[PDB]
């Protein structure tokens, strides 16, 4: 499964 | 080039001769863009992020142009906090992490 | 080193007398680790990405050792599906993107 971890506050 | 991480590595890309700013994400498997209009047919897909799974639209073989660099891969269009250029394309342009 | 991106840039770090795998994520602003025990006072915070938001605990000046180098900063600890080393610690170890 396609994993995409951008993170924003 | 060689971009530092003192600030979000946001560069510009011309997806299908159209300009939109996106983030270079070594933490993403694919390239995800916020509601955009690409032609051709598409397959719905499920991808996962920090919070769970979401439904995104899939387009195959779209010509992307990251900082004067030619790349042709799969772009996903769906709700995403920011536009993202994932490893799927970053590789095609010989991008690497060095420290 | 020179991490190529044809596969998740996972590396080994060392924090609180523990070895753990983390992801070199240039797409994250802070550093989020899976639930664990760190010493000191921490404050709440909501961080979000694709999929939603999760409440984390923020600890400051925590000494980390990314795949071989020193680096103390801010480590957020919460229900993250994977450990992530953000741009806050990546810069401290002089990390960059080159394509």
Curated annotation (Swiss-Prot), chain A:
It comes from Human immunodeficiency virus type 1 group M subtype B (isolate JRCSF). Signal peptide: none annotated. The gene is gag-pol. The modification Phosphotyrosine is found at residue 5. The chain holds residues 128 to 136 of 1439 of the full protein. This is Gag-Pol polyprotein. HIV-1 lineages are divided in three main groups, M (for Major), O (for Outlier), and N (for New, or Non-M, Non-O). The vast majority of strains found worldwide belong to the group M. Group O seems to be endemic to and largely confined to Cameroon and neighboring countries in West Central Africa, where these viruses represent a small minority of HIV-1 strains. The group N is represented by a limited number of isolates from Cameroonian persons. The group M is further subdivided in 9 clades or subtypes (A to D, F to H, J and K). Resistance to inhibitors associated with mutations are observed both in viral protease and in reverse transcriptase. Most of the time, single mutations confer only a modest reduction in drug susceptibility. Combination of several mutations is usually required to develop a high-level drug resistance. These mutations are predominantly found in clade B viruses and not in other genotypes. They are listed in the clade B representative isolate HXB2 (AC P04585). The record marks 5-6 as: Cleavage. It comes from the Viruses.
UniProtKB/Swiss-Prot annotation, chains B, C:
Residues 1-5, 49-55, 88-99 are annotated as: Dimerization of protease. Residues 20-89 form the Peptidase A2 domain. The active site is at 25 (for protease activity). It comes from the Viruses. Homodimer, whose active site consists of two apposed aspartic acid residues. Aspartyl protease that mediates proteolytic cleavages of Gag and Gag-Pol polyproteins during or shortly after the release of the virion from the plasma membrane. Cleavages take place as an ordered, step-wise cascade to yield mature proteins. This process is called maturation. Displays maximal activity during the budding process just prior to particle release from the cell. Also cleaves Nef and Vif, probably concomitantly with viral structural proteins on maturation of virus particles. Hydrolyzes host EIF4GI and PABP1 in order to shut off the capped cellular mRNA translation. This is Protease. The gene is gag-pol. The chain holds residues 491 to 589 of 1437 of the full protein.
């Amino acid at each position: 499964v396609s994993q995409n971890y951008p993170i924003v506050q | 080039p060689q971009i530092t991480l003192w600030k979000r590595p946001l560069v510009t890309i011309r997806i299908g001769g159209q300009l939109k700013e996106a983030l270079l994400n070594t933490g993403a498997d694919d390239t995800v863009l916020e509601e955009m209009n690409l032609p051709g047919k598409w397959k719905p897909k499920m991808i996962g992020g920090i919070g769970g799974f979401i439904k995104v639209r899939q387009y195959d073989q779209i010509p992307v142009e990251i900082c004067g660099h030619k790349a042709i891969g799969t772009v996903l269009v769906g709700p995403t906090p920011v536009n993202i250029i994932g490893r799927n394309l970053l590789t095609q342009i010989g991008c690497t992490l060095n420290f």
